[PDB]
């Protein structure tokens, strides 16, 4: 008899401590869809192709609207779309927002903003020849617009300030500074959700909303405890704005780290055990260095989240039988992935880089990164099949674009650790568009069997449809 | 500059005695100059897989009827450290061979005491 | 014959059995293959009755030299075909398995076949009775007073 | 004929099979070619019982060459479909097929086919026996004459 | 003291399952982690002559019915540039083997090296 | 966590152009770039035993069934104090191997050189 | 042979029953080694019926030596198969198995193939009655006057 | 156990081994369950222990 | 037939009165996870390794927002992470919480402010 192997999702033991962990597909993303007796398909991620050269690694991307282009900042300069029209200092990721009047940067710790005429002014305290307040303002962690006013937080104590409505390089006049103060500390990250200042602490999320107050020194934000989250993120990007609230990776203030979303009034996990390990593996350090954001094309709303030593990518739109990840890397030896900082303009979506000073574009008929091959991996979670005598191993793949016959590793293991001989088959051929990818006569299934199924192409591969006959 | 010579992977293990292979053969590693057949004193043996990671096995080696290593019926990739002794033992307890130190057949000897020596 | 040792003969029943082959992912570890060869041993000694069964050529290992498997069978062109179909069929029951009706018929085919040249040697006519008259129509013997066969 | 090699003789088998043909849109995968042509030297062989069994022509091969297939097989263009049918049925319990009823049918007639004429040459009538007249009408023709048969 | 030991420099190809040499068969050695038969991921392979005069030849390494490699008929050392992923195919052309990751160093040839790494 | 593949380090002598054991064979050790069966041109050999304790034996090496070195019925290691060239002869006198030189360089002069100019 | 020992016997039937072999990724309990050791001995014991049954060359382990594992069987190289063949067939009881239709089959076969040359042995044919004459054709005896047959 | 109190003779299997990545932790003959059974399966150890999908054949 | 048992919760009778109880996992976890015809395992509780030399017996552990730290009243001492910070009296349990300026103690009946200066 016919047995159909899910390939989204496979099991594994991990020999670190002979775990159950979970075997996640590599450069493969998960498209839900009954193509024939499969309801649903794995697609490589798209390829990167070279678009521009700038002058460094990106360092923060956002979309002006204002201005209806991508920003971008690249190592010491920042770009609208293509032309400079700036300069920033630093190495590190910076923040980004933009108004009406200009293009603010968060950068060692200052707002500087960059007008659209040209003039680039930093956020500093009223002079005090004015009548006006004078504000402790000290390093700003992160920034965000909202109703023409930048909110930024101070470093690492719990106050944010607003500026002025007319004047947008100074604080309010008479009231800019609010606190959380339902905690002991945290002002980590600031972000708008729907109309709401919302500050993310570490142990706490809170929700403000404009008072509508007139008066001279009365507060503009009144904090809404109804809409609190108990929970903080890991570090200043660990939070990107995901379904209709955001989606952050919790502090180890509560508990071990993890992948939540905000609902209402409460956060909901999307991690998996695996991932939580693959989380719990980094220190706090390696964990609030770690960048969030998110991606959108063909109906596929992935969250991409890059660490020192790891991308994940969470598939919502594929996640009916659970949280559905996977494993985003370049080269054959799991290297971190090279593209980063994604945004959509015009028709195409653009990313920036991490080791190299280019921007790339994400052509859709190529897998490979700037003319580099990609190992991409699918495998089947292991099951007990005592005296099983497989054959005619199957997989229905969707041929016919490629510059080569490319071909794909097929392997078995027996432990769910190490992995048998690889044989390799003709996945796929140019201009044919009828292959039956199989292999007729695999072995003798002892006590348990998986299966590897590693793809090294220049060429997209989509799988589906993998099948056995197990006698 | 080719400095790298294409050899063959997978070694050949065959009978002392007869041009055949020791088919379901033992190999004990343990430390240099000492019986590795002891527990106590063998050294780690791991298998290299496609990835990269080295997983750690059971001691004594299973020889198959090419006379190259299996670890359950499939060729796999063994490493361990630099220095090492071999003790190679037949299906039957039978002695074929003991290598005390398997540097000491590498065929340049003399580059050894040369690049411990003389300075870079 | 590419088919030349007790190991060789050992994978073509594995292969006919579908266990384990050279397309295979999966492989039966050393020491399976090591039982199988005590099966063919054990089974053509069976046959081979100590010279009384059937003659096949089979050389039989000698325990000094240690590996059976690597030991060429001996065996002529033309018996390796029955003799490892026949050993498919005896070690399938140690893999949960039984032979299908193809090989359990080959299997009998190639005995028989094995047994055919064999039998027709075996097939002899015993010599006359101590009783018999010699006749006196043979004329030697008249002379010679050897009016009666020997016999035996 | 078009198939004038052991390779065209496994891949019809393999095509009638239903296991690597282009009706389907399979391919013949190496490793099936090469334990095949080792199945077809087997059955040959065990067929041709040096000399003593099936004869068709089928030539040999040695291990000086080093690919099997690629060879001629010999065999005259009546025995080719005969040849192929049964290689057919020997290697289908490899992939835990069976071959169907026609496949069954179609080597049995191929094989009494293959036999046939072997067998007409093979009727043959032994001689006279040793202690037998030649008759009084035959000397009179042959002065010289023999009064018995010689036999053997 | 000793210096050298003497030892068999020629390869030797056998399949995987059985005590049998690779009679005609090919190998092609590539980047490491890939497919070899590809000359997109083809590396280079030199002769190295009785002198070592490193001469280049094409890809598919022959190898002898004795299981050793050949070039023209003639015995031949062949040498590679860095470490290689390697396909050693049957004469029927059944993947006899494939390796990712393969890396041993040439022995010969020292007196070069150590003047190359030495401080005179 | 490891650096060197699993390895057999014994030498094993098979045939030129087909795959069997050189069986009651020759090996014969002599001056570079020389023919080695003159006594002339031949040079000495040590056994090196497991401690490293070496005896001097005379130069026609037997070769046994199995390919490999023996002097009293026991595989034994063979080394000499500088380079050489190696014949491999086969059962009837046929010269199954040739190789001038063996490192490609004479370990024992070129200590003397290397003692001379490399810095300490 | 590789079979020479009551726990060589009974490791090759517990691997035929495919309750302890490699290919099943078990071992032997040494309680069942016991209980199949006891068996094979009652067996034996059974099939001997104290010479006047079928003749093997079993050695039986005698109370005094400890370990009746681990002793040599002293069976003939003939012997071995059927005998690990109906061992695995009296012990699958015990597990609430049944030997398979193989299994049975070189059961019965080899207690056959074993009785055989025993039966050519014992087919002897009684003397003649102490009433048959010797005959006159007998002359040496009629002359020493041996005129009938003895008998007995 | 057969009443689900008092537990009956203990039989030592080896549940796990170095470096040993495929065990079949099984015991072969288990005896007639008279009215009640339960099964106990403890284990002392210094590393870890991972269980699940126990079975039995049960005729 | 092959039938499974379930493991993650067995059951018994109390031998004092005969009543019907549930018999726990000792030093176990139980995954939810499929692996195979299983729907969950069961994982060994964590191991302890010595990581520190405290001055005795627990008497309370907080997570510090503030110093971003965790504290610990081990005997009669009080430690920021690793290193001593404090003195605290008493012998049992005590309450902790903590604020902009100082960790605070709630012990015998006092609540006392150790602050970071």
């Given at each position: 008899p016919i047995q159909q192997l899910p390939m989204m999702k496979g099991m594994g033991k991990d020999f670190k401590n002979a775990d159950y962990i979970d075997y996640l597909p590599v450069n493969m993303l998960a498209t839900p869809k009954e193509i024939l007796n499969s309801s649903g398909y794995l697609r490589s991620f798209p390829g990167i192709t070279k678009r521009y050269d700038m002058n460094g690694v990106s360092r923060g991307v956002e979309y002006n609207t204002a201005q209806n282009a991508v920003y971008r900042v690249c190592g010491g300069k920042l770009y609208k779309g293509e032309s400079e029209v700036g300069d920033v200092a630093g190495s590190g990721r910076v923040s980004m927002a933009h108004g009406r009047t200009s293009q603010a940067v968060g950068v060692n710790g200052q707002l500087v903003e960059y007008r659209y005429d040209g003039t680039v002014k930093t956020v500093s305290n009223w002079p005090a020849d004015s009548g006006f307040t004078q504000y402790e303002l000290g390093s700003v962690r992160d920034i965000t617009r909202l109703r023409g006013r930048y909110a930024w937080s101070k470093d690492g104590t719990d106050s944010w300030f607003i500026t002025d409505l007319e004047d947008e390089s100074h604080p309010d006049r008479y009231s800019a500074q609010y606190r959380a103060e339902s905690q002991p500390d945290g002002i980590i990250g600031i972000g708008t959700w729907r109309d709401f200042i919302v500050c993310f602490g570490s142990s706490t999320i809170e929700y403000f909303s404009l008072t509508g107050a007139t008066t001279a020194?009365?507060?503009?934000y009144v904090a809404q405890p109804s809409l609190m989250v108990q929970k903080g993120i890991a570090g200043t990007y660990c939070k990107t704005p995901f379904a209709d609230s955001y989606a952050f990776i919790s502090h180890p203030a509560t508990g071990a780290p993890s992948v939540y979303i905000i609902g209402s009034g409460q956060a909901s996990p999307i991690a998996t055990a695996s991932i939580e390990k693959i989380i719990r593996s980094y220190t706090a350090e390696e964990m609030a260095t770690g960048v969030m954001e998110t991606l959108r094309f063909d109906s596929h709303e992935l969250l991409i989240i890059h660490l020192p030593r790891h991308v994940l990518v969470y598939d919502a739109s594929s996640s009916q039988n659970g949280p559905q990840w996977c494993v985003l890397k370049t080269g054959l030896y799991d290297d971190v992935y090279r593209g980063v900082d994604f945004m959509y303009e015009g028709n195409q979506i653009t990313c920036g880089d991490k080791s190299e000073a280019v921007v790339g574009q994400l052509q859709f008929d190529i897998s490979s990164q700037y003319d580099k091959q990609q190992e991409h991996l699918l495998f089947t979670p292991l099951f007990k099949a005592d005296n099983a005598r497989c054959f005619d191993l199957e997989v229905e793949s969707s041929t016919g674009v490629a510059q080569y016959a490319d071909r794909l590793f097929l392997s078995a293991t027996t432990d769910g650790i190490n992995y048998g001989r690889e044989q390799m088959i003709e996945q796929n051929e140019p201009?044919?568009?009828?292959?039956?990818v199989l292999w007729k006569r695999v072995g003798r299934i002892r006590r348990l069997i998986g299966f590897k199924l590693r793809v090294i192409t220049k060429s997209p591969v989509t799988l589906s449809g993998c099948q056995i006959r197990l006698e | 500059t080719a400095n790298v010579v294409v050899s063959n992977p997978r070694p050949i293990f065959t009978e002392s005695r007869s041009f055949k292979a020791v088919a379901n053969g033992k190999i004990y590693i343990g430390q240099i100059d000492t019986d590795p057949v002891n527990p106590a004193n063998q050294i780690p043996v791991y298998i290299e897989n496609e990835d990269g990671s080295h997983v750690q096995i059971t001691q004594p080696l299973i020889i198959n009827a090419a006379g190259k290593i299996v670890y359950n019926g499939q060729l796999v990739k063994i490493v361990t450290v630099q220095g090492h002794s071999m003790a190679i033992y037949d299906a039957n307890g039978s002695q074929v061979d003991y290598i005390a130190?398997?540097?000491?057949?590498?065929?340049?000897?003399?580059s050894i005491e040369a690049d411990k020596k003389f300075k870079y | 014959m590419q088919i030349k040792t007790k190991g060789d003969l050992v994978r073509a029943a594995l292969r006919k059995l579908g266990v384990a082959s050279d397309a295979t992912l999966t492989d039966v570890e050393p020491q399976s293959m090591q039982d199988a060869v005590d099966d063919l041993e054990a089974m053509m000694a069976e046959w081979y009755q100590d010279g009384k069964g059937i003659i096949t050529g089979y050389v039989f290992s000698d325990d000094e030299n240690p590996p059976a498997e690597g030991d060429d069978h001996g065996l002529r062109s033309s018996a390796v075909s029955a003799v490892f179909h026949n050993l498919a069929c005896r070690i399938a029951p140690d893999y949960a398995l039984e032979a299908t009706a193809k090989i359990i018929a080959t299997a009998k085919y190639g005995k028989e076949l094995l047994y055919k040249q064999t039998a027709i040697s075996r097939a002899k006519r015993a010599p006359y009775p101590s009783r018999m008259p010699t006749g006196s129509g043979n004329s030697f013997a008249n002379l010679n007073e050897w009016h009666y066969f020997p016999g035996e």
């Open positions: 020194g009365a507060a503009l201009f044919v568009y009828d292959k039956r | 130190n398997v540097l000491k057949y590498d065929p340049d000897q003399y | -």
